[PDB]
């Protein structure tokens, strides 16, 4: 596993509104992630960051979203 932005339906980033909370963290673990946090230094703005995410879960890629 590794750390990165969690992908969503479809191929979209998970924008976090509560950076000072466990918003992204909880959502991250929801996909089998160990942890997560709101990332501000994102090329696409605020993206949900996940720590120790399994290669089984999709990540934010340079593609078009739904």
UniProtKB/Swiss-Prot annotation:
Q: Which GO terms describe its molecular function?
A: sodium channel inhibitor activity; toxin activity
Q: What is its main location?
A: secreted
Where does the entry say this protein is expressed, by tissue?
Answer: Expressed by the venom gland.
Site residues by UniProt (Key residue for activity on mammalian channels, it controls twisting and flexibility of active residues at the C-terminus)? 60
- Which keywords accompany this UniProt record? Disulfide bond, Ion channel impairing toxin, Neurotoxin, Secreted, Toxin, Voltage-gated sodium channel impairing toxin
What does the record's miscellaneous section state? Negative results: does not show activity on rNav1.2/SCN2A (neither peak current reduction, nor inhibition of inactivation). Adopts a cis conformation at 9-Pro-His-10.
What role is this protein assigned? Alpha toxins bind voltage-independently at site-3 of sodium channels (Nav) and inhibit the inactivation of the activated channels, thereby blocking neuronal transmission. This toxin is active on both mammals and insects, since it inhibits inactivation of rNav1.4/SCN4A, hNav1.5/SCN5A, mNav1.6/SCN8A and insect BgNav1 and DmNav1 channels. In vivo, it shows paralytic activity in mice.
Homology family = Belongs to the long (4 C-C) scorpion toxin superfamily. Sodium channel inhibitor family. Alpha subfamily.
Protein name, as recorded:
Alpha-like toxin BeM9
